Design brief:
This protein is an alpha+beta fold. The chain is built from seven helices and ten strands. This is Ricin A chain.
Length: 263
């Protein structure tokens, strides 16, 4: 039912990763909602269940496969399947709890984690912050194996949490931000793993606020500036959507677009 996008870390290149992220974005957004050249994800309100999720089938060089389920309203990884078992993060509400029952319906073993899938929770479980977790093709290769072996006792909880953190940034955050996609492309090109710098972290942290600021803007102009960080940790002030067009690829729906109001 739900669309499937395939990616493998086995012999991954800049091009194969680029193809993957483009395909993810294409399945996340319909094209109905583009504001200041930036696409918006579907509104949760009234979204039919048959259009709610996409599936990302990840394979690795170790010949293992896991399937991530992404919510189209926010690109969130809501859970995963590995063989005979599926695991879902603790739902935020009753609607989301019902929604995830439509995922991996033929799986033998269904589990819901007591913990939510937000970075705060995952970092505390990993025993490491995002700033200290290496990203790249190698980390993703290893993350796929760690997710695969969790149900059989091969993967400790901190490793599982770390592996989710890797997957989320390399898939969901890359889909949300061309800038983060670019940072992952660089890591793949040189096959060099590294933790995300402050520019990546602050973009991740600011996605909701940037989405709202753009959508509530007066003709693109923010009422309040948003502070981001450069690679060296120094401040970068955002006053307008214009500077974000090469940076952000998709936004969460936050408000209705104001009438065209052309002069």
């Amino acid at each position: 039912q739900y669309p499937i996008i395939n990616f493998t870390t086995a012999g991954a290149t800049v091009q194969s990763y680029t193809n993957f992220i483009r395909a993810v974005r294409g399945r996340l957004t319909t094209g109905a909602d583009v504001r200041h050249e930036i696409p918006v994800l579907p509104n949760r309100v009234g979204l039919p269940i048959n259009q709610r999720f996409i599936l990302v089938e990840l394979s690795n060089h170790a010949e293992l496969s896991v399937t991530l389920a992404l919510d189209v309203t926010n690109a969130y990884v809501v859970g995963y399947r590995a063989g005979n078992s599926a695991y879902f993060f603790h739902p935020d509400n009753q609607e989301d709890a019902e929604a995830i029952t439509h995922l991996f319906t033929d799986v033998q073993n269904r589990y819901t984690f007591a913990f939510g899938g937000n970075y705060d929770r995952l970092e505390q479980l990993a025993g490491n912050l995002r700033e200290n977790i290496e990203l790249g093709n190698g980390p993703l290769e290893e993350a796929i194996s760690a997710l695969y072996y969790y149900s059989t006792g091969g993967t400790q909880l901190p490793t599982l949490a770390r592996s989710f953190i890797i997957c989320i940034q390399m898939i969901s955050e890359a889909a949300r931000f061309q800038y983060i996609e670019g940072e992952m492309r660089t890591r793949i090109r040189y096959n060099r793993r590294s933790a995300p710098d402050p520019s990546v972290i602050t973009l991740e942290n600011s996605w909701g606020r940037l989405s709202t600021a753009i959508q509530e803007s007066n003709q693109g102009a923010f009422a309040s500036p948003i502070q981001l960080q450069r690679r060296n940790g120094s401040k970068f002030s955002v006053y307008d959507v214009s500077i974000l067009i090469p940076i952000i690829a998709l936004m969460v729906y936050r408000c209705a677009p104001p009438p065209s109001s052309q002069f």
